[PDB]
Design a protein around this ligand. Structure first.
Ligand SMILES: NC(=O)C1=CN([C@@H]2O[C@H](COP(=O)(O)OP(=O)(O)OC[C@H]3O[C@@H](n4cnc5c(N)ncnc54)[C@H](OP(=O)(O)O)[C@@H]3O)[C@@H](O)[C@H]2O)C=CC1
Ligand SMILES: O=C(O)CCC(=O)C(=O)O
Ligand SMILES: [N+]
Length: 416
């Protein structure tokens, strides 16, 4: 279905668990500002190629909009709008002074050289300059988009701004040399681990030796497994990748699994471990299930097969609403995706704060601030879920949309 219509339907489904005026719902149903520009670059051969770029600012009631830029050949305006709407609730759920934004360029970066990529990054900034800024709209890395491109775009923005204000704060995810932040690489996994700790505390169970079956071995998944093993007292018993997955009741070492995967191209066939399908790992007797590879790994046809006490949605939407309602019945505690993986945007906010203050924090301060933020956000969502007797995803929507509504009413944008 159309991603934007799906996001609007999700917001409308959330709207009936809270008292929100019709005018506010109609306001939140459409992005406040959408910018579509031509992005011309000189290719290596010498020809000029024009690309289509997007920058959607859904809502800036709570502050400047935040959201990454994805370089994908299948990128559409509808997807960018849906993701900007999602970023609004994402930043609202962790109580950030941010709004929701999103950008994108319809391009295949694989067919682009380094110089062509830098030209594209600089031309995108030269085109969307008038609607971005450290207090207006702060982009970030996304799919096929990395700190190198952030450094290039930051440099272009500083050249246009003539170093008048803090140009480091215009974009996040930059390298450490130019206004980068420590703790950025493990932000999503660290936040997910904090939320898993809070969820286990809510369930009133001890984590000394409990099984965890991480699904996926990306930047999310590998670090999620490593931190679950490291400072959580847990026991990694199953990890998986696109090619396959492994299982060991005795225990597992995430680092030895990662180096084997890097030296062979996949985790599959880890010595001393039984190779199992990703489906078999999804339905495995564990306490924490943490999908961090791809969305929609849990469906109605297999939702009943999950026995995990906690399902930590590190991936961006791995559970469907049908499976959501099915899994709520069994008593399985669910952590919504835009609450579980909010550590990335929280550390991006920390980077922006350090940039605007001109003062940079150590790893320990970043970790502690993120710990407090994630703990507060999870407890706010869970108390709403228990008080209203609703699904954790619905409670997170109620919290985020309520925050944005309150900001909109206080600005006077809407009356009722
Ligand atoms: N970690 C982060 O910084 C962030 C995490 N997320 C979400 O986390 C998810 C993963 O991101 P991240 O791990 O960082 O990066 P990647 O998506 O690059 O890594 C995910 C890995 O999971 C494996 N995988 C891919 N598809 C499947 C599949 N169908 N079944 C099983 N395993 C699969 C692959 O391992 P391989 O191909 O090598 O076998 C892949 O490299 C995404 O949905 C993302 O939106 C959210 C925000 C940021
Ligand atoms: O980190 C950010 O500010 C936004 C990146 C993004 O799109 C996300 O985390 O979903
Ligand atoms: N994030």
């Amino acid at each position: 279905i159309d991603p934007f219509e799906m996001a609007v339907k999700q917001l409308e489904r959330a709207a009936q668990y809270m008292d929100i005026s019709e005018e506010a719902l109609e306001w939140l149903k459409k992005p406040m500002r959408i910018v579509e520009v031509s992005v011309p670059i000189e290719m290596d051969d010498g020809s000029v190629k024009v690309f289509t770029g997007f920058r959607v600012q859904h809502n800036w009631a709570r502050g400047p909009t935040k959201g990454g830029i994805r370089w994908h050949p299948a990128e559409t305006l509808s997807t960018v709008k849906a993701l900007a709407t999602f970023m609004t609730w994402k930043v609202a759920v962790v109580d950030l002074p941010y709004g929701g934004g999103k950008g994108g360029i319809i391009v295949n970066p694989k067919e682009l050289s380094e110089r062509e990529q830098e030209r594209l990054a600089r031309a995108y900034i030269r085109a969307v300059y008038d609607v971005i800024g450290p207090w207006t709209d702060i982009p970030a890395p996304d799919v096929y988009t990395n700190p190198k491109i952030m450094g290039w775009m930051m440099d272009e923005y500083e050249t246009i701004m003539r170093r008048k204000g803090p140009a480091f704060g215009v974009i996040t995810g930059k390298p450490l040399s130019i206004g980068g932040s420590l703790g950025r690489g493990t932000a999503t996994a660290q936040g997910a681990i904090f939320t898993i700790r809070e969820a286990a505390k809510a369930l009133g169970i001890d984590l000394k030796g409990k099984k965890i079956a991480v699904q996926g071995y990306g930047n999310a998944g590998y670090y999620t497994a490593k931190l679950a093993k490291e400072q959580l007292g847990m026991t990694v018993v199953a990890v998986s990748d696109s090619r396959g997955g492994i299982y060991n009741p005795d225990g597992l070492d995430p680092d030895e699994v990662l180096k084997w995967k890097r030296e062979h191209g996949s985790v599959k066939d880890f010595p001393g471990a039984t190779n199992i399908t990703n489906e078999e790992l999804l339905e495995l007797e564990v306490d924490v299930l943490a999908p961090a590879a791809i969305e929609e790994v849990i469906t109605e046809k297999n939702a009943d097969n999950i026995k995990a006490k906690i399902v930590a949605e590190v991936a961006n939407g791995p559970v469907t609403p049908e499976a959501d309602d099915i899994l709520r019945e069994k008593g399985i505690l669910q952590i919504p995706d835009f609450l579980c993986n909010a550590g990335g945007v929280t550390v991006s906010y920390f980077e922006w704060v350090q940039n605007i203050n001109g003062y940079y924090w150590t790893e320990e301060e970043v970790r502690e601030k993120l710990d407090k933020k994630m703990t507060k956000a999870f407890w706010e969502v869970y108390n709403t879920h228990k008080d209203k007797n609703i699904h954790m995803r619905d409670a997170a929507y109620v919290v985020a949309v309520s925050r944005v509504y309150q900001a909109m009413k206080d600005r006077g944008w809407v009356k009722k």
